[PDB]
């Protein structure tokens, strides 16, 4: 749709390491979350999917979305069965692959949760109190979702 082979090997040029980047280019062009050996320092996984966005949807900014949404993703297990963990979990790698566009995720979260469309409702406001300026870490679902 968007990714091309030109646009991954440049995101991964600027924004990983030279022995990563082959690693960089394989999580793009499969929509995974990156791994690629950032071990020692566990915050660098994260900066780096923020390069990554920024170069690949640099033209279509609508398209990314923040890292710290992936958290709101919690809230599908809430429904205490399988298919809610599933979903869950779903969510988590969804929300941490950086060439993920967000139409995308989104579509594919919605679809599994949608025999649970209050979880899916209460995802979309913790993203919103997060856009808001709360730290969500701080407050759990059942402050701000009452259902």
């Given at each position: 749709?968007?990714?091309?082979?030109?646009?991954?090997?440049?995101?991964?040029?600027?924004?990983?390491?030279?022995?990563?980047?082959?690693?960089?280019?394989?999580?793009?062009?499969?929509?995974?979350?990156?791994?690629?050996?950032?071990?020692?320092?566990?915050?660098?996984?994260?900066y780096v999917y923020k390069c990554l966005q920024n170069v690949?949807?640099?033209?279509?900014?609508?398209?990314?979305?923040?890292?710290?949404?992936?958290?709101?993703?919690?809230?599908?297990?809430?429904d205490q069965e399988d298919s809610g963990r599933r979903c869950?979990?779903?969510?988590?790698?969804?929300?941490?692959?950086?060439?993920?566009?967000?139409?995308?995720?989104?579509?594919?979260?919605?679809?599994?949760?949608?025999?649970?469309?209050?979880?899916?409702?209460?995802?979309?406001?913790?993203?919103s109190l997060r856009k808001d300026g709360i730290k969500i870490?701080?407050?759990?679902?059942?402050?701000?979702?009452?259902?």
């Amino acid at each position: 749709s968007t990714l091309t082979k030109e646009l991954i090997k440049d995101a991964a040029e600027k924004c990983c390491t030279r022995n990563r980047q082959e690693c960089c280019i394989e999580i793009m062009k499969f929509g995974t979350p990156i791994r690629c050996g950032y071990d020692r320092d566990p915050k660098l996984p994260g900066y780096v999917y923020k390069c990554l966005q920024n170069v690949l949807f640099a033209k279509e900014p609508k398209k990314k979305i923040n890292l710290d949404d992936s958290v709101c993703c919690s809230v599908f297990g809430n429904d205490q069965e399988d298919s809610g963990r599933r979903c869950e979990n779903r969510c988590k790698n969804l929300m941490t692959s950086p060439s993920i566009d967000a139409a995308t995720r989104l579509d594919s979260i919605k679809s599994c949760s949608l025999l649970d469309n209050v979880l899916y409702k209460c995802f979309e406001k913790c993203r919103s109190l997060r856009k808001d300026g709360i730290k969500i870490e701080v407050l759990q679902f059942e402050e701000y979702c009452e259902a």
